Amino acid sequence: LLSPLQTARQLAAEFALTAVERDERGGTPKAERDALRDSGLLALSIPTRYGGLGARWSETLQVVREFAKVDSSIAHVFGFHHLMLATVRLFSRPEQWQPWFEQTARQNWFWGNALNPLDTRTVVKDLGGWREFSGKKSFCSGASDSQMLIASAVDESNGGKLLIAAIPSGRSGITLHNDWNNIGQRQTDSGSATFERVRVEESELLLDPGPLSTPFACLRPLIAQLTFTHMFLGIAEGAFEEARQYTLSETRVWHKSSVREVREDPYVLAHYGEFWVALEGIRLLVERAAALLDEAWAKGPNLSAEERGHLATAIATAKVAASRQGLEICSRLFEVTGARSTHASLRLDRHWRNLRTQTLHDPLDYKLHELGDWALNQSLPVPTFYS
Amino acid sequence: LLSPLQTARQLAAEFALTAVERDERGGTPKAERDALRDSGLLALSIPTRYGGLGARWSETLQVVREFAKVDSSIAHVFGFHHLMLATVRLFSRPEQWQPWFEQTARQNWFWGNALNPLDTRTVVKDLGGWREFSGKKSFCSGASDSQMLIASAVDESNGGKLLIAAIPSGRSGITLHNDWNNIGQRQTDSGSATFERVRVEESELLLDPGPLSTPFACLRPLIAQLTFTHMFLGIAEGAFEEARQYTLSETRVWHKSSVREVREDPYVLAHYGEFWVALEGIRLLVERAAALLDEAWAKGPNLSAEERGHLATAIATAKVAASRQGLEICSRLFEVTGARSTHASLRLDRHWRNLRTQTLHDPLDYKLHELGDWALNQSLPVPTFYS
Amino acid sequence: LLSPLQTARQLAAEFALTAVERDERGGTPKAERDALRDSGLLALSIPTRYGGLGARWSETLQVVREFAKVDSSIAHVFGFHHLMLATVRLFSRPEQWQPWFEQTARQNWFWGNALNPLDTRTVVKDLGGWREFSGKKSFCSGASDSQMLIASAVDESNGGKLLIAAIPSGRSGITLHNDWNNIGQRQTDSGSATFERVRVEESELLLDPGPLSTPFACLRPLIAQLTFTHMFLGIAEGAFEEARQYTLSETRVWHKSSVREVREDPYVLAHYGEFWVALEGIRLLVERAAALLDEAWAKGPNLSAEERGHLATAIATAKVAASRQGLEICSRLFEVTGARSTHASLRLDRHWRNLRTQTLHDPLDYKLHELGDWALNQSLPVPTFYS
Amino acid sequence: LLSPLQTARQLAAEFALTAVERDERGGTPKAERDALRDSGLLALSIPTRYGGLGARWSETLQVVREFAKVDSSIAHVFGFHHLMLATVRLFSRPEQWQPWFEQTARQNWFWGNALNPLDTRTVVKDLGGWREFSGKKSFCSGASDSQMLIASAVDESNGGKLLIAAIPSGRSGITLHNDWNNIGQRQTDSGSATFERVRVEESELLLDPGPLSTPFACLRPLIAQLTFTHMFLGIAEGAFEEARQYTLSETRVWHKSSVREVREDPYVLAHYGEFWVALEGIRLLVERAAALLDEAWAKGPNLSAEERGHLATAIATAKVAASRQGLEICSRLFEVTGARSTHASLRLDRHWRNLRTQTLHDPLDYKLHELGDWALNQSLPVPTFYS
């Protein structure tokens, strides 16, 4: 009876009731993850012909953004779940990903991340009949309480080629440490894992066409980048709305102010006008990138490298704006909420901390470098796991 | 048979050949205004049933933006000509503006500005069957070399009531001074005017419904605001493109740089990335406001105050971004063009000077106040001649 | 025999060993406060004739800054202790403050804050030979584990008159709640207090000359402002130094960088150059204000309103720079320390959180208003408890 | 009867009367240069034992700053005159520079610049008995109407070594084109020169100890950098004062303002407070660098490389602040002077144009790179002609 957005907004309201306490507690948000299981939204990105809801990417990412207004850790593991599904869809054969889609939709499997291209400590050995992953990995966003994992390993042949597999999260030999302890994103379980001779079947390797191959396959890093981008916008929007409520409900006018109510103070209003101009610009850039992703995805394997590159530029443009202007809102909102809004029971700084943490994993200065290469030299970005 | 955009682009390419020397001379760009007369573009906004081209406002404003890339003074008088046509369309009866539209399209009349709501030095006396305007006016953008003028006067009853008329620019008693000397917009003829017992017939007064009446008539200041906004964007786009050509052609690498070519300098590329993110955000905000103007214009007299207010907010948001981020591009581009690009024969500072002058006639701080009133309090802007 | 600066540096090195874990715990830093008692530094500002060290204000504030590099909560309660001593020195008769000074230096009394001019929930009744304070107070910075308190109350005559007293912290009727829970300054004990018929002798009231009387007595809010300002600078300096160590020890180069070492990355170096320019400007502004405070203090009761006003302007100028540029360093340092520096065991965000909390108790926008009144109109600031 | 500063301020008042008209005219300010000749200030930096006034560098640069408030072109050629005297003082033998100092003080010789290390088009040939400079040069600041020139040439031996000479400006073979045509600094005569077999005696070569030799000799580029820096501060201070006068005299309050007078408008006052904080920070950084230059100069040939390096860092820090914050004041002052202040008769943009032009000859991004190398790595700057 409800649309996916309506279902997400209802869930977000329930999440908001415990979000502040859970930011302090950290750990696995098991009750919230089960609420996602029961909602149906783990099948949001899966087409209806496999039992899913058939949303376009722009709708899936809209739900990521909606969760991020209240709970960016939940938004992160939810968005990464659909990124893992995109990974098998783009990197493997229909005989592999179609059953995975059907089982995920039927059983509400939660997919977690164990793919770190910049962590070559996990290696794969070939034992003829099967292969085995062995080593350690970090930044395993949402591996705990998951049913399936996307795991990477290096095959030390001619310098070391990355190999990606989809495997059950409880398979023998996998030890998920859940030592994730960070100032932000405190419920994404982005801790460590140990792989001890973990068996991987040929049928579980994502090889055809595999990573960084066709332009369509090369949408995978762009989906990841735009997932983060929607999170960034959601965090800024949630911070803004929380500040609004506080300004109107609790903030007292400064005794030197010319007005009697905070909501008429000329400096307070100018701050809110600057927040508005920033948010409006981010919103249009993010939504334009999402529409371009919809259009690129619809071309499938016929996607051109040119169209992929223009999408990549549009996403990076949105990400820079969401990162920089978003973090500024999360800091400067304290000037309109005031000295009492720093009470630890409110944890109003959680928006800033979450966004500060997540904007560092892909350095902004090198995003500007890439965008300048387009703006000055008309050079398309080179497809990587970050671009 | 070229489209209006193609026609405007061809003219802009010709204007570009002399724009630098004309920035120096100032005065009236009579040759360029005659090129506009010959082009048909003075009828761009006039519906086809009166002999015009039938463009939507977004298309008319796109031409303003295109002209502003190469010559913001021409962009200004061209945009203001269409604003004058909008003024008679919105404030007077069809018995008045339909003949004016037909004559303008048939004879390529150029319409000029003599409407300043601030300056109240012009007063209107009633002589029975006719009236007379007498006084001084400033900022008469495009009055020189025009066929028709929109002129305002104050009637001295009940503290003053503003009266607006459309009258031929050469009518007895009108003196245009051509004493316009400004650091920017140096070919807009925005000088001074003197009216001495200028006869004004009742059929020339714009009374039904007159200014600041219906939401539809209250589109007039919004068209003005969005005309300036398209000019601001065009100036920044033209400055950006001129900087690109200089960086790639003339600028030398700094002897402390690690790279052989300025094309690859990490700081140069980062600047161009920041210019790109700024321009892309402005572009989407301006084009969104343009689309909302098309949709509101289509409502005609059925337009609601609520839709007018949301359009107003969208335009002001775009105007703030275009003003602030546009001026920043026009200043900071010198860091990527280098010490030789300040040669007086290039007049590369003309973009900054033009934007610096035009961003002052409506103070940004009070636009942010208005936007904060919306963002914080959900208060729609109050219709005025600037909002 | 060490100098006070050397003694403070030694203590700061010891405080640094546990500052991160104490930021987590919160509560009262009893061990560190006892280390202050043993150090002699609680008598730093007390003249030698009373058994103190005889420091100038610039020297006392230098120690506040030194502590703030490693532990801004300790810096806060230490600076506020000396502010309390300044309060009795400036507002009461030598018959009152000379014994308090002698006893403080002999017994290493820690003085705490219970003076909030905003909060008027505490009232004083006159019972003839004595008075009684009853009510609630908030923001009681350093009241816990103190020997003496500076407490204010309102007398309900002629719309309210503020009364200030110095009283022992354990006097019957005083309850300190230790309910202080804030995102920053987590060991300043700035919780709540309750007074119930707290007896106050006439000899404990600070009436002659009392607050906001002579220009010399009006140094009290300026000492408070410059104490915060030295804390703001110290926080930014400590954050900068902690970032340096991380950049050089732990941060890895981005795989798109041209350089092998983060030490040589052009964007990293540019960030550190911008941090340097900011810190150097703040440092000179703060030290100039400190020198002007020494010179004004030396005038004693002969201080003129004009010299007080110029000092006020100098302090506010330093405070704006330290607040704004300091918070920027504390945020932007994460771009040069990288994605691994957000580990919760490092609490590298503690500098930003501490500065973000403390910069709100006196709104920056109205400090800029005051400074513009000087810069434009040559109007001296009006003495208040914040200016 | 007047001190040099008083004499300069009196001259500055006379210069201010024609400054706006001369910014338009360009060319050589011959009347103003003769006024400098008659003032005695061309001997300001020459010790009294040679007939000069014996000012310290901080006083000479204070006069540069004072001229720059009203006329940055005059400030530039005046400052470069004393830089040329410093060049012979630091690079040549007492038997060379002592007579040059005596003759300059006795005859008020004006020294001009023809030294461009980045213009290797002028070469020197050795004819045994004498040498000859031949080729072209650009950026010859103030060579016109000068008595002496500092000229450079490359000796094409082992790659090309730079050779510096002091020679009469009217010597046979020198053709000063005076084609200087720039958007700012329009009266510095920084045009071109042609050298046609210009004879140079051994006694005119600056060889012992020559350029970039001892730390003391290496003060020459630092004097140049700090001369520009004092100019930058002076320009910002003059722009600020001119804006003040306009705000208080001519600016009208915006019709949406809450106040009746511009000087009480809260946004206007906040702008002026930001100008104040910026100017105060620049002032202290510039004055601190000037004091350090005084102290370094006084050490003479005993100056250590360490003390030179710390001076270089202090100057670069001041220059970055003066450049960036100065240019921001020159742009943002238009928001408090308003729409009528762009009148071309006022040329209020001349401050921005002058500072925009002069901040480009040493790129700010690479200054930040150098300062970061100090801040992060504690690496002293490497002496060059720009550092």
mmCIF file of N, CA, C and O in Angstrom, chain A residues 145-189:
data_model
loop_
_atom_site.group_PDB
_atom_site.id
_atom_site.type_symbol
_atom_site.label_atom_id
_atom_site.label_comp_id
_atom_site.label_asym_id
_atom_site.label_seq_id
_atom_site.Cartn_x
_atom_site.Cartn_y
_atom_site.Cartn_z
ATOM 1 N N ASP A 145 26.346 -9.307 10.673
ATOM 2 C CA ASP A 145 24.910 -9.501 10.484
ATOM 3 C C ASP A 145 24.533 -9.474 9.002
ATOM 4 O O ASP A 145 23.471 -8.984 8.621
ATOM 5 N N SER A 146 25.406 -9.982 8.147
ATOM 6 C CA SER A 146 25.107 -10.055 6.725
ATOM 7 C C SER A 146 24.971 -11.510 6.302
ATOM 8 O O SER A 146 25.443 -12.428 6.981
ATOM 9 N N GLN A 147 24.291 -11.709 5.177
ATOM 10 C CA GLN A 147 24.124 -13.034 4.597
ATOM 11 C C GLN A 147 25.124 -13.324 3.492
ATOM 12 O O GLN A 147 25.568 -14.471 3.344
ATOM 13 N N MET A 148 25.502 -12.309 2.722
ATOM 14 C CA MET A 148 26.447 -12.460 1.631
ATOM 15 C C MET A 148 27.472 -11.341 1.716
ATOM 16 O O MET A 148 27.178 -10.251 2.220
ATOM 17 N N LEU A 149 28.680 -11.633 1.228
ATOM 18 C CA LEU A 149 29.784 -10.681 1.176
ATOM 19 C C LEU A 149 30.357 -10.632 -0.228
ATOM 20 O O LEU A 149 30.424 -11.644 -0.930
ATOM 21 N N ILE A 150 30.780 -9.442 -0.629
ATOM 22 C CA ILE A 150 31.644 -9.267 -1.785
ATOM 23 C C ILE A 150 33.063 -9.134 -1.242
ATOM 24 O O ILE A 150 33.377 -8.163 -0.551
ATOM 25 N N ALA A 151 33.927 -10.100 -1.548
ATOM 26 C CA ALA A 151 35.288 -10.123 -1.024
ATOM 27 C C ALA A 151 36.283 -10.066 -2.172
ATOM 28 O O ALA A 151 36.055 -10.655 -3.232
ATOM 29 N N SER A 152 37.397 -9.370 -1.960
ATOM 30 C CA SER A 152 38.452 -9.308 -2.959
ATOM 31 C C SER A 152 39.728 -9.958 -2.435
ATOM 32 O O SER A 152 39.961 -10.052 -1.227
ATOM 33 N N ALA A 153 40.559 -10.394 -3.380
ATOM 34 C CA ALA A 153 41.866 -10.961 -3.086
ATOM 35 C C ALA A 153 42.766 -10.694 -4.281
ATOM 36 O O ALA A 153 42.290 -10.458 -5.391
ATOM 37 N N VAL A 154 44.077 -10.719 -4.048
ATOM 38 C CA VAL A 154 45.052 -10.508 -5.112
ATOM 39 C C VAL A 154 45.625 -11.857 -5.526
ATOM 40 O O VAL A 154 46.019 -12.666 -4.678
ATOM 41 N N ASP A 155 45.629 -12.117 -6.830
ATOM 42 C CA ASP A 155 46.328 -13.264 -7.395
ATOM 43 C C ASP A 155 47.716 -12.795 -7.802
ATOM 44 O O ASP A 155 47.865 -12.036 -8.764
ATOM 45 N N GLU A 156 48.731 -13.246 -7.071
ATOM 46 C CA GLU A 156 50.093 -12.790 -7.305
ATOM 47 C C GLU A 156 50.655 -13.404 -8.583
ATOM 48 O O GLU A 156 51.503 -14.301 -8.537
ATOM 49 N N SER A 157 50.172 -12.921 -9.728
ATOM 50 C CA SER A 157 50.631 -13.346 -11.045
ATOM 51 C C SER A 157 50.865 -12.099 -11.884
ATOM 52 O O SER A 157 49.939 -11.306 -12.087
ATOM 53 N N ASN A 158 52.101 -11.927 -12.363
ATOM 54 C CA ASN A 158 52.496 -10.770 -13.173
ATOM 55 C C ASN A 158 52.229 -9.454 -12.443
ATOM 56 O O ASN A 158 51.766 -8.477 -13.038
ATOM 57 N N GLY A 159 52.524 -9.424 -11.140
ATOM 58 C CA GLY A 159 52.374 -8.235 -10.330
ATOM 59 C C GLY A 159 51.180 -8.237 -9.394
ATOM 60 O O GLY A 159 51.179 -7.481 -8.415
ATOM 61 N N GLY A 160 50.164 -9.053 -9.670
ATOM 62 C CA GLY A 160 49.017 -9.155 -8.785
ATOM 63 C C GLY A 160 47.736 -8.577 -9.349
ATOM 64 O O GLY A 160 47.564 -7.355 -9.378
ATOM 65 N N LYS A 161 46.827 -9.441 -9.799
ATOM 66 C CA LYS A 161 45.540 -9.021 -10.338
ATOM 67 C C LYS A 161 44.450 -9.200 -9.289
ATOM 68 O O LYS A 161 44.395 -10.225 -8.606
ATOM 69 N N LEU A 162 43.584 -8.198 -9.167
ATOM 70 C CA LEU A 162 42.496 -8.266 -8.201
ATOM 71 C C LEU A 162 41.420 -9.237 -8.673
ATOM 72 O O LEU A 162 41.037 -9.245 -9.845
ATOM 73 N N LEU A 163 40.932 -10.061 -7.747
ATOM 74 C CA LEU A 163 39.880 -11.037 -8.013
ATOM 75 C C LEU A 163 38.740 -10.805 -7.030
ATOM 76 O O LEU A 163 38.977 -10.677 -5.826
ATOM 77 N N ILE A 164 37.506 -10.743 -7.540
ATOM 78 C CA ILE A 164 36.324 -10.453 -6.735
ATOM 79 C C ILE A 164 35.431 -11.689 -6.698
ATOM 80 O O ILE A 164 35.229 -12.344 -7.724
ATOM 81 N N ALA A 165 34.882 -11.994 -5.524
ATOM 82 C CA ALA A 165 33.975 -13.126 -5.370
ATOM 83 C C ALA A 165 32.801 -12.733 -4.484
ATOM 84 O O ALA A 165 32.922 -11.858 -3.627
ATOM 85 N N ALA A 166 31.660 -13.391 -4.693
ATOM 86 C CA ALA A 166 30.497 -13.267 -3.820
ATOM 87 C C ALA A 166 30.345 -14.567 -3.036
ATOM 88 O O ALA A 166 30.154 -15.627 -3.634
ATOM 89 N N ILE A 167 30.429 -14.491 -1.713
ATOM 90 C CA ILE A 167 30.440 -15.709 -0.901
ATOM 91 C C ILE A 167 29.613 -15.497 0.356
ATOM 92 O O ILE A 167 29.422 -14.359 0.813
ATOM 93 N N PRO A 168 29.071 -16.580 0.923
ATOM 94 C CA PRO A 168 28.271 -16.451 2.147
ATOM 95 C C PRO A 168 29.106 -15.897 3.289
ATOM 96 O O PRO A 168 30.272 -16.262 3.461
ATOM 97 N N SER A 169 28.496 -15.004 4.077
ATOM 98 C CA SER A 169 29.248 -14.327 5.127
ATOM 99 C C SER A 169 29.615 -15.260 6.269
ATOM 100 O O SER A 169 30.564 -14.971 7.002
ATOM 101 N N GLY A 170 28.893 -16.359 6.441
ATOM 102 C CA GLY A 170 29.224 -17.310 7.481
ATOM 103 C C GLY A 170 30.082 -18.478 7.042
ATOM 104 O O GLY A 170 30.217 -19.446 7.800
ATOM 105 N N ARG A 171 30.670 -18.420 5.849
ATOM 106 C CA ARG A 171 31.461 -19.536 5.353
ATOM 107 C C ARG A 171 32.658 -19.803 6.258
ATOM 108 O O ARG A 171 33.292 -18.876 6.769
ATOM 109 N N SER A 172 32.967 -21.088 6.442
ATOM 110 C CA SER A 172 34.087 -21.501 7.281
ATOM 111 C C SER A 172 35.375 -20.791 6.885
ATOM 112 O O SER A 172 35.718 -20.702 5.703
ATOM 113 N N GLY A 173 36.093 -20.291 7.886
ATOM 114 C CA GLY A 173 37.336 -19.591 7.655
ATOM 115 C C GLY A 173 37.238 -18.081 7.716
ATOM 116 O O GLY A 173 38.278 -17.412 7.735
ATOM 117 N N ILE A 174 36.029 -17.524 7.744
ATOM 118 C CA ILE A 174 35.830 -16.082 7.832
ATOM 119 C C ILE A 174 35.619 -15.707 9.288
ATOM 120 O O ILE A 174 34.723 -16.244 9.952
ATOM 121 N N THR A 175 36.434 -14.778 9.781
ATOM 122 C CA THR A 175 36.298 -14.237 11.128
ATOM 123 C C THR A 175 36.126 -12.728 11.021
ATOM 124 O O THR A 175 37.068 -12.020 10.650
ATOM 125 N N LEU A 176 34.925 -12.246 11.337
ATOM 126 C CA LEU A 176 34.595 -10.823 11.284
ATOM 127 C C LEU A 176 34.800 -10.227 12.675
ATOM 128 O O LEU A 176 34.058 -10.546 13.611
ATOM 129 N N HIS A 177 35.796 -9.347 12.808
ATOM 130 C CA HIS A 177 36.230 -8.908 14.131
ATOM 131 C C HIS A 177 35.272 -7.915 14.773
ATOM 132 O O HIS A 177 35.138 -7.909 16.003
ATOM 133 N N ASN A 178 34.610 -7.080 13.972
ATOM 134 C CA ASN A 178 33.695 -6.057 14.477
ATOM 135 C C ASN A 178 34.392 -5.177 15.513
ATOM 136 O O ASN A 178 33.879 -4.923 16.605
ATOM 137 N N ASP A 179 35.594 -4.729 15.158
ATOM 138 C CA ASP A 179 36.371 -3.789 15.953
ATOM 139 C C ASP A 179 36.205 -2.352 15.475
ATOM 140 O O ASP A 179 36.971 -1.476 15.895
ATOM 141 N N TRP A 180 35.235 -2.098 14.598
ATOM 142 C CA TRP A 180 35.023 -0.765 14.049
ATOM 143 C C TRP A 180 34.801 0.250 15.164
ATOM 144 O O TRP A 180 33.850 0.136 15.944
ATOM 145 N N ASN A 181 35.686 1.247 15.231
ATOM 146 C CA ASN A 181 35.651 2.244 16.300
ATOM 147 C C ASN A 181 36.119 3.567 15.694
ATOM 148 O O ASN A 181 37.324 3.813 15.585
ATOM 149 N N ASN A 182 35.163 4.409 15.309
ATOM 150 C CA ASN A 182 35.450 5.620 14.555
ATOM 151 C C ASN A 182 34.638 6.771 15.141
ATOM 152 O O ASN A 182 33.659 6.548 15.857
ATOM 153 N N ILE A 183 35.057 8.012 14.854
ATOM 154 C CA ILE A 183 34.335 9.154 15.425
ATOM 155 C C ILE A 183 32.998 9.363 14.726
ATOM 156 O O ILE A 183 32.073 9.945 15.310
ATOM 157 N N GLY A 184 32.870 8.905 13.472
ATOM 158 C CA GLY A 184 31.613 8.967 12.758
ATOM 159 C C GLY A 184 31.302 7.622 12.121
ATOM 160 O O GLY A 184 32.120 6.696 12.146
ATOM 161 N N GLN A 185 30.103 7.533 11.532
ATOM 162 C CA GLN A 185 29.638 6.293 10.901
ATOM 163 C C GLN A 185 29.741 5.109 11.860
ATOM 164 O O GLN A 185 30.188 4.019 11.488
ATOM 165 N N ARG A 186 29.311 5.320 13.103
ATOM 166 C CA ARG A 186 29.664 4.415 14.193
ATOM 167 C C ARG A 186 28.859 3.120 14.206
ATOM 168 O O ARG A 186 29.087 2.286 15.090
ATOM 169 N N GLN A 187 27.940 2.916 13.258
ATOM 170 C CA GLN A 187 27.163 1.680 13.213
ATOM 171 C C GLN A 187 27.208 1.037 11.829
ATOM 172 O O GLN A 187 26.284 0.314 11.449
ATOM 173 N N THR A 188 28.288 1.266 11.077
ATOM 174 C CA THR A 188 28.491 0.632 9.777
ATOM 175 C C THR A 188 29.335 -0.640 9.843
ATOM 176 O O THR A 188 29.551 -1.271 8.802
ATOM 177 N N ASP A 189 29.825 -1.027 11.027
ATOM 178 C CA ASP A 189 30.595 -2.268 11.198
ATOM 179 C C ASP A 189 31.808 -2.326 10.268
ATOM 180 O O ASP A 189 32.172 -3.392 9.772
#
